[PDB]
Amino acid sequence: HTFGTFQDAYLSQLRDIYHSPEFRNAPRGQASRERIGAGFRLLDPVQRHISVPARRANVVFNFAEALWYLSGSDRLDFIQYYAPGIAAYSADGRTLRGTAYGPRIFRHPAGGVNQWENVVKTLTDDPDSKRAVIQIFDPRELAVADNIDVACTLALQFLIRDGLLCGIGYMRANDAFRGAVSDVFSFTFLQEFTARYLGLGIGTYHHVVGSVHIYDSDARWAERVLDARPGFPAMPDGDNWPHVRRVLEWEERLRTNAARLSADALDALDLPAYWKHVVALFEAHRQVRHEDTPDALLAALPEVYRQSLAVKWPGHFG
Amino acid sequence: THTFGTFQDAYLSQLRDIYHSPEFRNAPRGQASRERIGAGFRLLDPVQRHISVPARRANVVFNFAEALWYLSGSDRLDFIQYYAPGIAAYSADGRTLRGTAYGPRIFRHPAGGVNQWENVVKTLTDDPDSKRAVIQIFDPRELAVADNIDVACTLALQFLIRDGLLCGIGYMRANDAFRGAVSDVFSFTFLQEFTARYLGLGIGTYHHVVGSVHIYDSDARWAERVLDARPGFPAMPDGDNWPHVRRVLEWEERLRTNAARLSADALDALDLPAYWKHVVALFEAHRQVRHEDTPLAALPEVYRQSLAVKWPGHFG
């Protein structure tokens, strides 16, 4: 169960569940194909994107979720802008609970703990440590009846092995067709972010899940993906927190349509090239959401991003 | 992750993997080890949870004591160190254990005081297909304790009802493939079976999933002997075993403190199912060893072998 890139693992697991499900059932009323205790190992976790056109993977959403996690926010307004359906998991219409990993990572409700800093500290004092774990799940989620937003991730673990930072995601449940695309993106994004911060190379990523499933309502789309390569760029070395802070300021201005960035204004930004392309994704997305003129911007993006935009919004960027 | 029938087959195969084909050699907290990352196995027959290789000297009395210690919800050192004196090295205050004490994590978790085992049985009663029946062990504050000598190695246990059978998954950040794996798999499949009996279900598959699976170099020679080197484990009776556990725990404490002793006849006369009388007999046999009383026929053969190999001068 070793794969070079996420895409190979993603398609192989999809084929497995679809053609040889262990179980067919309906947890919480939702008809599913299911396999129990499934995982994979990725040799190259930076290659985290799905580029199969039939899947229409949304790289803007992918970065938005990961940056939303890094922001530490539980606010619905940030993330529902990139995925409007996510408001169905908000009980109050302005925050999320188990969907919001950001608070779980940087200020966990069990103690207010910043687990990322404790992980950095643990691995600095003892590079070989087996303890560098970020707990996501909380014992009180199941204690409230009728909880509509229970975290699907149990924990993330980091290890330094031979100068490379390895990551492990443990989940109780995972949608193999939908959620897995976002989750592995964000977990290997955090893995890489942490590796640059520690001045390390990138090792393997292990994903392991209690219930992996495909909803029957997704079977047709899953089939077309099964019926149906530029590289993902490397995040720059060192501490990327200042750049994330700047990117997050632009995220909010573009999202609220308080600002627009021409192609020349994007290139003038005080940001490494990798993060300039992320802000460009948010300006492109602003054009869609606020119905501005599609833009030149496209030409300066890495090919992976251009393809994702072309396939997701073909009337805008095709 | 590969499929096995009994724990012993999985245990020996994994032991051979890490010993002969380690993925890494390193020394976390200064302890040199052989290691693989992201390793697990599935057991099709989790009740068969014991290691009977004589060179391993598996201690079935400790195995039951640990599992019952968990069911008691206790964090007390004096209970568990009586069966495993080395466990004292993980107690910072000489009275309690922290990450080693899974009992409180299951039944009164430090995040809110939550009884997660009750929440799990409620969750699976209301929705047997539930993907949410998770017992969290690990806690986010454990890494905030400066110089913590006892950080929980288990992240979570998960139970799933599939086709009338209770399946279990144990998720661990790290597991000693030679030592700890023996008692952890025993205790998790014990809890799995206990929960299945309570729910009126048969036993499904047990899945073991671990981040760092390792053999400490100080154990390498003993692991070699085990590698260079069958009676069935009995089933736990159907239904709610909590009243029987409560009565077994009363006797456990009396025998451990030498406040009582039980003859062969006194053991047969106990108001317990035979399965649990044998557990009390293991505690009485253990009392004879540790309190140096003078020294079995009613025991299942698996227990006889464990006693004969672990204390040959007494029961060999």
Residue numbers in the entry:
A (entry chain A): 4 to 231, 239 to 305, 307 to 329
B (entry chain B): 3 to 231, 239 to 304, 309 to 329
Task: Provide the authors' own sentences about this structure as they appear in the paper.
We previously demonstrated that MilA, a CMP hydroxymethylase in the mildiomycin biosynthetic gene cluster in Streptomyces rimofaciens ZJU5119, can convert CMP to hmCMP12. MilA and CH are akin to the superfamily of thymidylate synthases (TS), which transfers a methyl group from CH2THF to dUMP to form dTMP in the de novo thymidylate synthesis pathway and, hence, DNA synthesis. In this study, we demonstrated that MilA has a substrate preference for CMP (kcat/KM = 39.2 mM−1 min−1) over dCMP (kcat/KM = 7.84 mM−1 min−1), and thus offers an opportunity to investigate the mechanism by which conserved TS evolves the preference for ribosyl over 2′-deoxyribosyl groups.
The crystal structures of apo MilA, MilA in complexes with CMP, dCMP and hmCMP were determined. The structure of C-terminally His-tagged MilA was determined using selenomethionine (SeMet)-substituted MilA-L167M mutant at a 2.20 Å resolution. The electron density for residues 305–308 was poor in the structure of apo MilA but resolved clearly in the structures of all the MilA‒substrate complexes. There is no obvious difference between the structures of CMP-bound MilA and apo MilA, with the root-mean-square deviation (RMSD) being 0.34 Å for 634 aligned Cα atoms. Compared with TS and CH, MilA has an extra domain consisting of five α helices (from α9 to α13) in its C-terminal region. C-terminal truncations either from residue 235 or from residue 249 of MilA are both insoluble (data not shown). Presumably, this region could function as a domain to facilitate protein folding.
